[PDB]
Amino acid sequence: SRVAKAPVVVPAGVDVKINGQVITIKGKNGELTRTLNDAVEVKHADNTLTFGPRDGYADGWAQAGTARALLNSMVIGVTEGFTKKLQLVGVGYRAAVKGNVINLSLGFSHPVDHQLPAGITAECPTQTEIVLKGADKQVIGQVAADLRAYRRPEPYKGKGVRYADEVVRTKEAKKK
Amino acid sequence: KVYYHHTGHIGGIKQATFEEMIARRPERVIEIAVKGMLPKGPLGRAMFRKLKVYAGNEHNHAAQQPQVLDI
Amino acid sequence: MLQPKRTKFRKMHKGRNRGLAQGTDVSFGSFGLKAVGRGRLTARQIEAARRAMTRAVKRQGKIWIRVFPDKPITEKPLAVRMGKGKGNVEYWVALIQPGKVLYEMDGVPEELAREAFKLAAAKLPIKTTFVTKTVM
Amino acid sequence: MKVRASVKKLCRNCKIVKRDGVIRVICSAEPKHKQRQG
Amino acid sequence: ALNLQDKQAIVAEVSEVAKGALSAVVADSRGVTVDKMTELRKAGREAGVYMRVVRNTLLRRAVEGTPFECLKDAFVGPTLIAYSMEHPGAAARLFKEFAKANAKFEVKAAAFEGELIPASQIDRLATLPTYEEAIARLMATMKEASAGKLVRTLAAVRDAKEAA
Amino acid sequence: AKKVQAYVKLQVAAGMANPSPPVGPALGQQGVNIMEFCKAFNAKTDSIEKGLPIPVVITVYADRSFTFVTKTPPAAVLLKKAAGIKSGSGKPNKDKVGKISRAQLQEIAQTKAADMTGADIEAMTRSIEGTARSMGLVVED
Amino acid sequence: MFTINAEVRKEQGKGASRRLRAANKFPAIIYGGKEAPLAIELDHDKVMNMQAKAEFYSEVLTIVVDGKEIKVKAQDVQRHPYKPKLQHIDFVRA
RNA sequence: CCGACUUACCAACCCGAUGCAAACUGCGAAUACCGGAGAAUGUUAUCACGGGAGACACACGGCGGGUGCUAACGUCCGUCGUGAAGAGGGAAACAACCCAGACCGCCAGCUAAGGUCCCAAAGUCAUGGUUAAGUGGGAAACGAUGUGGGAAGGCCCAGACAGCCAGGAUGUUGGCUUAGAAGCAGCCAUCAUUUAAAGAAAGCGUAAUAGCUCACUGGUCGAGUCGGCCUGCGCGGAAGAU
RNA sequence: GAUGUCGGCUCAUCACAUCCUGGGGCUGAAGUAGGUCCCAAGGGUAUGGCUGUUCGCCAUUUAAAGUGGUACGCGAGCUGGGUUUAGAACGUCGUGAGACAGUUCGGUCCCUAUCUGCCGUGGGCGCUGGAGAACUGAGGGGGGCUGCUCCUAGUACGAGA
């Protein structure tokens, strides 16, 4: 990775704690906002993060790009707050939030019992739009992954749960 | 090596799983690692009967206080 | 099959070798397909390979063929007990030997001839090599 | 998907990725070209 | 070069004109969204001003290896360069034509015959000059700013619409 | 996937934008209604000629909004007009169904200069030359 | 037209030539007239890819061995019966 | 009426270049063989005639060919190790393999084929590269940017390489056709334009239009990367009766 | 000096490339449905007839009527039906004796289990002085299948059904 051989700059008040192959990021965090890298040593200084050698997995630079992506993500995380825009295509499915639960369906009265930890919260403007709120980049996408694990976006009208990189072509009914 | 045995089935054969062994006391994983390292039938049995393992880090079957050992 | 009218005689001994039975270098053009292994061709495979090269290259360049079926081969069918004489003549066989180059070209650009030989190597029973000549 | 071996591409680019020890071919905007084998 | 000439070609190409050029302007708008990009090409052939889009890496290598027009750090991140080799006043006129579909706050700074012209000054330069009215304003700026009154000796064509 | 790609084509009259079959099916699919398009397109198309098709090129966001750029009359309509035709040849450079003067071609060039990028008044002309050649019109003096 | 290397050598037999191919070197010879040629070792690859074009064979070569320089161009070639790499090459003085 | 100017094409003898052969030949080894003469060794290997035969039914395998599909633990012939007609070492073992040739004794040593974490006798060996798959320690076609080294080479800090993002352009929905007919249903134009960059488009896709991948441009971005070819390791290909 | 057959009955058993419900990609899949389609040994996996019958032909049950192996599973299980079984003799052929997998009539099939397994069952011994009583789970199998309609639900989608 080109980018583990150039340092990554850290604002004022962002505390990036180096104690082992775990590095733990605080500033103005909703939660435990943290980074896992093994093959590199990252010292904090206090204004800029410095990348150098440690031991790791047998693939070439296995963790040194990993440390670059993850450090910058978590640092943007505690400051401004990470992205929050979740959505679904189709109607007749619900997207109604009640507390820490998201009510979704295939066609059925009962909820699908999709539930969230303490660390994060939601609300919904409309019955297709979900706002997830937090500071750790991983967990917001882990409840998004679970939401797509009962109905997905698949090409026939395109209907489903949409989040990050999307794998669907949005086909229609056939006519020849 | 998931240690199949005859025990009566239909359609297939019934088996013990590697997965069962952990849920029913921690010993059995450790146990079929030292068993399989001993010879033949009878000698491998005379050797075997000198091992004890149990639940591990909590087991009463240690009250003797033996000779302590690190390997 | 892309086979000869008559070579030698009509019914003939199979043709085993302990090493080289001729053909191992480039002999025309600027490039070709080398075998780097050994085995039989029933002429059907030569044809199949020729079709592939003619479908990729079209009019751009002519083909020089550096192999042909030499020896007729009998079969005694899998319906009757072996040990008593010699079967009907069934196919003409080309004996490919190790590093025998099969087909050569120069008319068409290098990448058309190289690609045309990759298609031809799927019709063949071994793993092969593009071979370059430039003049000699 | 099918038991199609060999991990040659099907579109001008695919994400070529070794999942659970079998290399899958799949496009970056399409689920159609997902193949179980390669 | 023989894989891609396009990327090697562009380094020589800024460096030639930017040594060459009486005014150039180093601005931020990125090498995406065709609508603003087309309009800065379009009006640029009218006023007699040429525009290239160039990385800050290419731009820093063009100042390292070759003489430039004195905007040696005025490039930051994704950066476009509009430049005139014969008519300095057109260079400032093109952003005032181009803000009618996007913006004018896009300039970071400008240069004029070796002098730094900031991003507040160019809004004065741009008010329908021909080459002589641009030149005239650069002398009116200096004359003001230099405290000696030997520095003033002509206004009757040097500070008119006449030849300057 | 997200509809964040490439300048989408449409070329339509002001009253040819109320039904769907003249337009093609695509706007409906990208989250734009035939009625909202029709109202938005007349805003910049009836400022000029409306009885013939004005070219329009569209960008669509992942949030089901749209932007559209509306232009003056196409050089391609003008070349039909100035030549006395409504139809071309369907086999250009091999069959020729009329002719256009060069001095006239430059006035067509100038009418399309509201949106043309060519550095000389000839450069604009040389782009609509191949437009004339496509429609079976011979470019002569 | 290329700049290649040689160390001076003479061998006899299959075993010797194979002992060169064991450490990724192989032999060559330099003729002219009807006399005792200049016998050399070469490297496998320093003469195969420089040879992937007709300029190797149409133009003359700077071949350096123990301060001797003589000028030579390629002649007909001997290739392995399982690799495209060069088993033995000929040269004429030019 | 007789006769005839008049090759446009095919595919030969032939001709040049190119490929090939037990039963074809312009050329032709290595090795084997004999008798002498010499070293060495063999308690006769070989010779006469008299008494006794047995074997002629061989088998998994080296060397090579025919028969067979360059299938078969296949079949046969000249040639040979082992079993036949010999203990031991090693192989989950065996008739037959590899090392090796059982006088007999030796709580002796060494070396072989084969081994060195326990089983089990000896290396979790010192030093480095790589696979995530129990591959290793189960096989081919076959493919790919699965991973690394190496010389030659293109690119290569002047910005690569590959992808992800965003753009994919000005005339332009060019002409016909048509639900519309847009680079991508079909076909003809097959170009020009400001440019730093955008083919009137390589591939996919409700067949289109749409949606989508693509170099190139600019972000991520400042160091390796990829094509041919030699090479260790990987992948799926590799589903059947305690 | 015996690895011995068809056909019927009984009794099984294992491989999953599963007849089916079940989770899931695709589709030239709108949805319903199907094609395409992977995991899966867990479990239910049909029968009477004629015929010595495989295979056949036919009626049918159940939501349903699968593939493969087993000395072509199982005469140290059963009958002994089948081939001229051994017998005429019809049909057939040769001079005849004799033959025929066309055929019709009825028609000789053994083993009390040594070791081995499989399931049920007792004696004797270690259980740490002996005795009686409850008893933990190291270990290991069984239910396991599958339709109907009420609700789920006339709703998303589609032109409409």
- Give the closest nucleotide to A149 (alpha carbon vs C1'): I24
With the CA atoms of G8, G12, G14 and G17 taken in that order, what torsion angle do they form, in degrees rounded to the nearest 10? -10
Contact F2 A169 (CB under 8 A): no
Count Cα atoms within 13 angstroms, Cβ side, for F59.
10
Indicate whether C36 belongs to any domain.
yes
Other Cβ atoms within 10 Å of F116 Cβ, number: 19
User: Closest Cα of chain E to F45: distance in Å?
Assistant: 19
Q: What residues have CB less than 8 Å from B6, skipping those under 6 apart? A: B13
How many Cα atoms are found within 13 Å in the side-chain-facing hemisphere of B8? 0
In D, which residues are within 8 Å of A167 by CB distance? 26-31
Please state the three-class secondary structure of chain F as a single string: CCCCCCCEEEEECCCCCCCCCCCCCHHHHCCCCHHHHHHHHHHHHCCCCCCCCEEEEEEECCCCCEEEEECCCCHHHHHHHHCCCCCCCCCCCCCCCEEEEHHHHHHHHHHCCCCCCCCCHHHHHHHHHHHHHHCCEEEEC
Residue in G58, G54, G51 with CA at minimum distance from that of residue G86: G51
CA atoms of A18 and B33, how far apart (whole Å) = 39
**Residue E25 corresponds to which tokens in the numbers above?**
């302007």
Q: What is the CATH number of domain A8-80?
A: 3.90.930.12
Which structure tokens are listed for G22? 């064991």
List the subunits that have 3+ CB pairs under 8 angstroms with F: A, E
Ramachandran assignment for E114, one of left (phi > 0), alpha (psi -120 to 50 degrees), beta (any other): left
Contact C132 G52 (CB under 8 A): yes
Q: Locate the chain G residue with the closest alpha carbon to C24.
A: G81
Which residue on chain E is closest to F7 by alpha carbon? E34
| Residue C87 structure tokens | 């079967």
Position C3 in a domain: no
CATH of domain F72-141: 1.10.10.250
Mark out the alpha helices in chain G (DSSP H runs).
14-21, 55-58
Chain G residue numbers with beta carbons less than 8 Å from the beta carbon of C26 are 79
Tell me the three state secondary structure of residue A144. helix
Find the distance separating the first CA and the last CA of chain A, reported in whole Å: 48
- What's the CA–C1' distance between D20 and I40, in Å? 19
> Residues of A with CB below 8 A from D31's CB?
154-155, 167-169
A48 to A65, A72, A76: CA distances (angstroms): 17, 11, 14
Q: Where are the CATH 1.10.10.250 domain residues in chain F?
A: 72-141
Tell me, yes or no, whether C10 lies in a domain: no
CATH number, domain A86-162, options 3.30.70.20, 3.40.47.10, 3.90.930.12, 3.30.930.10: 3.90.930.12
Under an 8 A CB cutoff, do G76 and C134 touch?
Answer: no
Q: Tell me whether the CATH fold assigned to A8-80 matches the one assigned to A86-162.
A: yes
Between CA F87 and C1' H193 the distance (Å) reads 26
Q: Is the CB of residue D31 inside 7 Å of nucleic acid strand I?
A: yes
Identify the residue whose Cα has the smallest distance to the C1' of H21.
C8
Q: Which of residues 18-37 of B touch strand I (CB under 7 A)?
A: 20-21, 24-25, 27-28
| Residue F9 burial (CB count, 10 A) | 11
Which domains are delineated in chain G?
1-94 (2.40.240.10)
Which residue segment(s) compose the domain that C28 sits in? 21-136
Residue type for position F53? P
- CATH 3.30.1550.10 residue ranges in chain F? 1-71
By CB atoms closer than 10 A (0-12, 13-18, 19+), residue B36 is: exposed
Minimum CA–C1' distance nucleotide for D29:
H212
G56 in contact with chain C, both atoms CB, cutoff 8 A: yes
| Terminal-to-terminal C-alpha distance of chain C | 30
**Touching check for A171 and chain F: CB below 8 Å?**
no
Whole-angstrom distance, CA of residue E84 vs CA of residue E47: 9
Rg (CA), chain B: 16
The encoded tokens of residue E27 equal 């601005």
Q: Tell me, in Å, the resolution of the deposited structure.
A: 13.5
Structure tokens at C22: 């001729």
Is residue F31 within 8 A of residue F62, CB to CB? The reply is no
Instruction: Name chain A contacts of D35, Cβ cutoff 8 Å.
Output: none
Contact A170 F29 (CB under 8 A): yes
| C9 inside domain | no
| CATH number of C85's domain | 3.90.1170.10
Strands of the sheet with C88-96, listed across from one edge: C39-41, C88-96, C71-75
CA of F11 to C1' of H186 (A): 21
- Which of 3.40.30.10, 3.30.1550.10, 3.40.50.1370, 3.30.160.620 is the CATH number of F1-71? 3.30.1550.10
Which chain A residues are within 8 Å of D27, Cβ to Cβ? 167
Cβ C17 vs Cβ C86: under 8 Å: no
Interface of F with E (CB under 8 A): 7, 69, 117-119
Tell me the domain boundaries of chain A.
8-80, 86-162
